[PDB]
Design an enzyme around this catalytic site. Structure first.
Site: not given
Ligand SMILES: *[B]([O])([O])[C]([C][C]([C])[C])[N]C(=O)[C][N]C(=O)C1=[C]C(Cl)=[C][C]=C1Cl
Ligand SMILES: [Cl-]
Length: 262
Positions: A45, A48, A105, A141, A212
């Protein structure tokens, strides 16, 4: 060879079981302190920031662009949509999407920014336009977070990201209103309390963006204003050998504490 700073970072890396990347720029004298500074890491993230900055750049020639409403459809929602879920069948402006992506995020918001740029390649093209030859955004994402060891997708280096973060916030890669807006957004981030911020003196002002992903990837990038001296830029990236490794925000806090000692 290595300095005592780098030796401390290496010992933290060893104790943590993972791979740590650090880049500090001290804008007082433009010196850099690096640890694995030219190795690639999954940005997660932290990407972003580049997406929001790319939209800010677009707004320099379309002054009302940030206030343009964008539809949020039910089908737009992905895995983490704390702000966008409040606007299903509704709208969010590009400014609101930028604030949500940066400060909460929100992944739906990030995907709207990417779409506004024509896809991940539009974010990469913006990076190249501001002199970042290293950043690459390949996916949206949430798949940009797979963080597979060795995979160049959705990676950059600590050195490149620190240089770009400096250009975007303290330099003039962006216009005046835009760079001030980016700083405002980063300073108001809500997700960073356990990361770089936790390792720095409380009197220092910080703007940051966390990230993350898989492989216990735990990241933070920050612009830091110590009291009474020139600002700093700090990138701390961390990733681990096993896919389901736990997050280690404490490692980022420890890295920041080490870098701040001198
Ligand atoms: B960001 O780091 O891109 C984001 C921050 C969080 C707080 C939402 N991270 C993620 O979306 C982490 N996602 C995964 O590890 C993931 C999720 C899904 Cl649904 C499918 C694949 C992956 Cl690698
Ligand atoms: Cl984050």
């Amino acid at each position: 060879e290595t300095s005592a700073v780098q030796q401390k970072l290496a010992a933290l890396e060893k104790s943590s079981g993972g791979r740590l990347g650090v880049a500090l720029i001290d804008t007082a004298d433009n010196t850099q302190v690096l640890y694995r500074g030219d190795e690639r890491f999954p940005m997660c993230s932290t990407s972003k920031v580049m997406a929001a900055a790319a939209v800010l750049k677009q707004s320099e020639t379309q002054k009302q662009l940030l206030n343009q409403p964008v539809e949020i459809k039910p089908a737009d929602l992905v895995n983490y949509n704390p702000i966008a879920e409040k606007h299903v069948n509704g709208t969010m402006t590009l400014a609101e999407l930028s604030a949500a992506a940066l400060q909460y995020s929100d992944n739906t918001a990030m995907n709207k920014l990417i779409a506004q740029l024509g896809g991940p390649g539009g974010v990469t093209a913006f990076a190249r336009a501001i002199g970042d030859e290293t950043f690459r955004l390949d996916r949206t994402e949430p798949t940009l977070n797979t963080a597979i060891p060795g995979d160049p997708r959705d990676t950059t280096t600590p050195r490149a990201m620190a240089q770009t973060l400096r250009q975007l916030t303290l330099g003039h890669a962006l216009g005046e209103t835009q760079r001030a807006q980016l700083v405002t957004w980063l300073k108001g981030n809500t997700t960073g309390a356990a990361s770089i911020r936790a390792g720095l003196p409380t009197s220092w002002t910080v703007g940051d963006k966390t990230g993350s992903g898989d492989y216990g990837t735990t990241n933070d990038i920050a612009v830091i204003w110590p009291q009474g001296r020139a600002p700093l830029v700090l990138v701390t990236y961390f990733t681990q050998p096993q896919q389901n490794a736990e997050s280690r925000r404490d490692v980022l806090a420890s890295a920041a504490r080490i870098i701040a000692e001198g």
